[PDB]
Amino acid sequence: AIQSQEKGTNQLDIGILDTGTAIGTTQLEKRISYRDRFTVPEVLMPQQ
Amino acid sequence: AITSVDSYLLSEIKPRLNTVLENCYIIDEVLKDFDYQTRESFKEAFCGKNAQHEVTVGFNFPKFKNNYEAHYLIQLGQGQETKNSLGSIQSSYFEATGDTLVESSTAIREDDKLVFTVSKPIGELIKVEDIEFAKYDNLQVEGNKVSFKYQTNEDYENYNANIIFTEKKNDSKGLVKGFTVEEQVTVVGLSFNVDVARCLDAVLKMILISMRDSIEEQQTFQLQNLSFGDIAPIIEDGDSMIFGRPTIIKYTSSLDLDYTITQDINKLTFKERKDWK
């Protein structure tokens, strides 16, 4: 379960970057570890 | 002239960077002091014609996302005027002269002269490569052609040369008015891999050393002086940091304008007038 799915646009001398952040609640009995990666195949984001 | 150091650097760095990266043994020589694995990984990734990654060059503040794997960001800096001429006269000319040029050319026979043809009208000839003419050779320049006596030179009837010359704009008199400026541009090699940033630093220093011999910054942009910053995270709050090591390139150059003089005098005349008091 995922909440507060913010894009977090930044505009910089180097160019644009996304630093967005979200809050996730796991299932029971899981030990998520730092820099573990998630993808959400149902959800598509627009980019240019 | 008025000059733009940033656009000069972009125009000069991009082709040189491409021509080094397409040439494996150059990188193999530049990176000889790095750790073996750093060297081989860089050469595998970015170098040679088959390279799947690529480096990129551009000015700061674009509106789009860049190739943060390896990107040279060019960033126009400060400057100040440093030396002035008396009357601000940087020079004077009898014939409005353009940029300096070097062109390859071949001799041809024409009417028992040898001639070299050049793409533009020759405002001044500085050097015909590997030739010093005697008076007997009857060296003459006319329009966009250099001409050279055939009689004793028949062996050279197809000789290949480089001509160093400069354009003419027009036949007019004037004063070059202006001053010297000392100006800074910063360049940074961005990468999210620190070893790539260190290799991009090495490659950039090599490129600038090679650039010092170019006609552009021999005639203008003189006294290249380099300073180097710390390696640091340029951006720190993505999913990963982006690192870079700045370098500052400082140049001394002339800012000036062609003040043409329309006044010309072609005869004095004398008269005596009598004072009867």
Q: Which residues contact B86 (CB under 8 A, 6 or more apart)?
A: none
Reduced to 3 states (helix: H, G, I; strand: E, B; else coil), residue B277 is: coil
Question: What residues of A are in contact with residue B188 (Cβ under 8 Å)?
Answer: none
Of A13, A17, A18, the CB nearest to B61: A13
| Four-residue CA torsion sign, B72, B76, B77, B80 | positive
Resolution value, angstrom units: 3.6
Taking CB atoms and an 8 Å limit, are A17 and B235 in contact across chains? yes
- The minimum CA-CA distance between A30 and chain B, rounded to whole Å, is 23
Exposed e or buried b for every residue in B259-275, given b needs 16+ CB within 10 A?
eeeeeeeeeeeeeeeee
Contact B251, B224 (CB under 8 A): yes
Q: What is the DSSP letter of A27?
A: P
B217 secondary structure, DSSP code: H
Nearest by CB to A17, from B73, B75, B238: name it: B238
**Do strands B232-235 and B242-244 pair parallel, antiparallel, or not at all (unpaired)?**
antiparallel
How far, in whole angstroms, is CA B264 from its chain's centroid? 35
B87: left (phi over 0), alpha (psi -120 to 50) or beta: left
Of A14, A15, A19, the CB nearest to B237: A19
Task: Report which of B76, B22, B72, B27 is spatially closest to residue B51, judged by C-alpha positions.
Answer: B22
Output the CA torsion sign for B188, B192, B198, B202: negative
Amino acid type, B188: V
The residue whose two tokens read 């000059």 is B3
End-to-end CA distance of chain A: 28
The answer to whether A14 contacts B64, with C-beta atoms less than 8 Å apart, is no
Q: Which of residues 234-263 of B touch A (CB under 8 A)?
A: 234-235, 237-238, 242
